[PDB]
Amino acid sequence: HHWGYGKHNGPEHWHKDFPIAKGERQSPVDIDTHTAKYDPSLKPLSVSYDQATSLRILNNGHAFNVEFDDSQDKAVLKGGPLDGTYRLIQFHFHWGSLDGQGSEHTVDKKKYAAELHLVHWNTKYGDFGKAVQQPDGLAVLGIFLKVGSAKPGLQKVVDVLDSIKTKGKSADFTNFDPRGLLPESLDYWTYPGSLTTPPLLECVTWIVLKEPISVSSEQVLKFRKLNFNGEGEPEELMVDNWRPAQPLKNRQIKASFK
Numbered sequence: 001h002h003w004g005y006g007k008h009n010g011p012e013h014w015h016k017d018f019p020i021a022k023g024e025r026q027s028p029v030d031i032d033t034h035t036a037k038y039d040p041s042l043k044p045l046s047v048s049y050d051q052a053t054s055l056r057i058l059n060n061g062h063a064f065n066v067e068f069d070d071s072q073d074k075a076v077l078k079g080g081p082l083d084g085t086y087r088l089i090q091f092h093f094h095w096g097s098l099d100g101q102g103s104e105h106t107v108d109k110k111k112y113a114a115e116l117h118l119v120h121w122n123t124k125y126g127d128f129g130k131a132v133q134q135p136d137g138l139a140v141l142g143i144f145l146k147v148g149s150a151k152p153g154l155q156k157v158v159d160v161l162d163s164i165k166t167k168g169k170s171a172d173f174t175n176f177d178p179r180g181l182l183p184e185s186l187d188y189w190t191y192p193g194s195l196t197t198p199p200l201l202e203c204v205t206w207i208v209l210k211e212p213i214s215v216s217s218e219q220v221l222k223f224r225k226l227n228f229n230g231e232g233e234p235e236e237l238m239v240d241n242w243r244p245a246q247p248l249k250n251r252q253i254k255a256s257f258k
């Protein structure tokens with residue numbers, strides 16, 4: 001009976017194995033746009049993905065991960081609220097069964113159809129596993145998806161999903177450029193939080209972009225054809241793999257923009 005997004009093993013159950021689920025800096029959160037304060041002091045955000053080296057795509061039974069070579073400073077995130085250099089290790093998404101839900105963060109209680117998480121680790125801790133034990137170990141760049149026009153830079157991802165339908169399947173996924181998943185503006189909100197999946201470690205600086213990307217209904221339909229189950233098991237569509245908003249507690253959300 002391991003964790004997931006079903007009635008019996010979903011977010012409201014996670015605290016029994018992962019008591020930090022009820023902690024002081026859990027994610028996601030609702031971003032109240034009127035309460036978030038412009039912080040002039042946030043340096044520029046620097047997204048340097050020109051040398052990114054993607055390797056593989058994996059269905060992990062919860063989402064799919066696009067994995068990168070993080071054994072050198074190739075694809076890095078710096079600036080904004082961050083001290084030092086954060087290396088891109090993977091990206092993944094969370095999405096809904098319907099276009100009216102799927103994001104983890106919300107904006108004035110609005111749910112987007114999906115949310116992209118670009119996951120980076122602080123190089124001062126040497127490896128990802130050491131980084132997640134630190135309060136400043138990770139920086140996750142979160143990007144909302146709305147349904148409208150297709151995202152050209154997403155299609156290579158969409159077209160490989162048939163080959164990783166079930167849990168534990170992977171495929172080679174070289175030469176994929178994550179710059180094709182960014183919106184025009186890098187205006188953002190930031191706050192200290194957590195992983196949104198078990199083990200729910202309180203190690204993340206969240207950087208949530210204001211501007212959503214547009215994807216087509218055909219693109220998100222292909223996400224919803226993935227499976228949570230393994231091969232030769234009853235089909236469970238991979239949908240609604242999002243944690244709802246958690247209490248803000250003693251946190252302030254800062255805006256990079258006036």
Ligand SMILES: NS(=O)(=O)c1ccc(CN(Cc2cccc(NCC(=O)O)c2)S(=O)(=O)c2ccccc2)cc1
Pocket residue numbers: 060062063065092117119128129132140194195196197198199
């Ligand atoms: N949603 S999010 O952006 O907050 C976020 C969530 C989860 C992760 C990473 N995963 C869990 C993890 C966490 C800690 C240690 C280890 N291993 C220790 C080691 O590498 O020695 C693994 S996962 O299994 O790839 C994964 C699971 C579900 C959906 C997506 C990714 C990163 C960011």
Ligand SMILES: [Zn+2]
Pocket residue numbers: 092093094117196
């Ligand atoms: Zn995530």
